Each structure stands twice: as C-alpha cells, then as structure tokens.
Amino acid sequence: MQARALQDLFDAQGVGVPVEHALRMQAVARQTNTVFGIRPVERIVTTLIEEGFPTKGFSVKGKSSNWGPQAGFICVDQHLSKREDRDTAEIRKLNLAVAKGMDGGAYTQTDLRISRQRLAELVRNFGLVADGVGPVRLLTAQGPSGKRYEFEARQEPDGLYRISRLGRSEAVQVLASPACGLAMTADYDLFLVAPSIEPRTRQLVDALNDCLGRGEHREMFHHSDNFPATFYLPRAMEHSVRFDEVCVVADRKSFSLLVECIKGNGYHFTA
C-alpha cells in the first residue's frame, strides 16, 4: 500500500495516525496474521505523536483538550478540556477525578510547553490566534462555549514556548508521564483483535510497540467515540465490497460490514 494513497485516505477521513505508523502496524498484522482495529486518533494530535510525546494509559483520568494551545493534552484544570461546555458540577467531578489519580504513582503534572511548529499548526488548522513575534506571543482561543481564552506563549531556553493563562505566573498544568516527565497525549487504543483460525492481547501490544520503536516510556499501546476507526489487515479482503490492508471504518454500519468480512475470511473475535 503506497504512502501517498494512505495519506490521501487519512486526510479525507480525518485520521491522525501517521502514515509511517500505519504501515508498520499493518506489517504486524501481516506477521501475526491478525486483524486489529484502533479507536479514533484525531489529526490534532498527529504533531504531538511525531514530536515524541508519551501517551496516556488506562490509569490516566480526565478529558483531553481539542482547542487552544493545550490541544492534545490533558489539563489539570478540566475547565480547559473539551468539556469546557459543561456546568460547574461536571467540571469539579472531572477535577476531582484528575486530583484523585494525581494522589498516586499513576501520573504527575508538568508545564504546558509546545514548539513553534505546533503553534503554527494550531493557528493554521485548529482555530488558534497568535499575535506578536519572537520569544513572546499572545494567544487567543475560543472554547466550545464560545468564550475566548487568552494565553501568553513565552519561549524557554530549550526553544519550547511555555504556555500560561494571560496575566498569571503559573504555566498551564497538563498531565505528565511519571517516567519521563513529559506531557502525555492520546494513545493508540485497541478495541478489536481478530486472530486467524488458520485477554490475550499482550503479545500483540508488545509486537506493536516494538515495530513503532518510539523508545522507552513512549509507547503508543498500553496493557489494559469509537469511529472513525482504523483497521489493519494481513491482506486486502473481499466479501461485493473490499477492505484494503489499511482501511478506515467511519461509522457503525461500516463496522458491521467489516465484521462480516473478517469473519467470512476466517478471523474470529469475541469481545
């Protein structure tokens, strides 16, 4: 499967998995003779994945952000998450849940720090406004409630822009990996595993993390809303519709047809 074909597919479907990752994960599907599907990966986290940020595990509580400079991360203050629409009680419950997991070795917190390229991408594609030049910039972002939030972007000595709410001294706090101390982005979540006939998923998770080779404590898969999902097949399958070695299932109806296709080709799954 050619890279430009898969990039065009992912661009049209709104899939955030890097094409290189999809090709390596399709190889594992071929080598293990196993069909598997991954939960949605938004394009707003593609840069964070390619920049090497670690990913959240099942023990990470709290909702991520789809707006502002905090997009793709999980803020300690859930008022900056994608649930910025919700009322006081739901945010405080999300805050308590984030505070609950913080009281343990599950995860920690760190300053929101993003690169020039990340800032330019958020401005170009995801509705961020950035005023000024050089090491200090003023950011304006509109939350899902329509309220606009202001942030200062201040370059630190290693080249990243530390993000703080305007007028405040404390940077925006985001959940961080306890191992490497970096902010965590979204993971690759296996939601279907169909091995060939002709929780036993730890071997596939380890094989997938090995083929991606992101390095220690930077795994995409963890040992542990559904669409658009990406599926990875040992070979292109037909049943008259055809699913390619890498395919996108946009909704439940496409998923129902894919299930019948993999079962018809001798692949079993029971979840």
DSSP for 153-199 reads: EEE-TTS-EEEEETT-SSBPEEEE-TTT-PBPB----EEEEEEB---
Q: Is 268 annotated as a binding residue?
A: no
Cα 135 to Cα 115, 132, 173, distances in angstroms: 11, 9, 20
Domain ranges of the chain: 1-41+187-271, 42-186
Yes or no: say if 53 and 183 are a contact pair by the CB < 8 Å rule: yes
- 8 A C-beta contact, residue 241 and residue 261: yes
79 known ligand binder: no
Backbone angles phi, psi at 261, to 5 degrees: -75, -40
Residue 32 φ/ψ, nearest 5 degrees = -90, -5
> How big, in percent rounded to 5, are the helix, strand and coil portions of the chain?
30, 25, 45
Tokens coding 270: 């029971």
Give me the phi and psi of 94, to 5 degrees please: -65, -35
Task: Kindly report the backbone phi and psi dihedral angles of residue 130, in degrees, each rounded to the nearest multiple of 5, phi listed first.
Answer: -135, 120
Separation of alpha carbons 211 and 201, rounded Å: 15
Element (H, E) at 149: strand 148-155
Token pair 């979204």 is found at 186
Q: Spell out where the chain is interrupted, by the residue before each break (C to N > 2.5 A).
A: 198, 224, 239
* Alpha helix segments (H runs only) across the chain: 3-13, 19-32, 46-50, 88-102, 116-125, 202-212, 252-264
- Identify how the structure was determined: X-ray
Q: Which tokens sit at 94?
A: 């999300």
- Residue 77: how many CA atoms within 13 Å on its side-chain side? 11
- Resolution of the experimental model in angstroms, please? 2.2
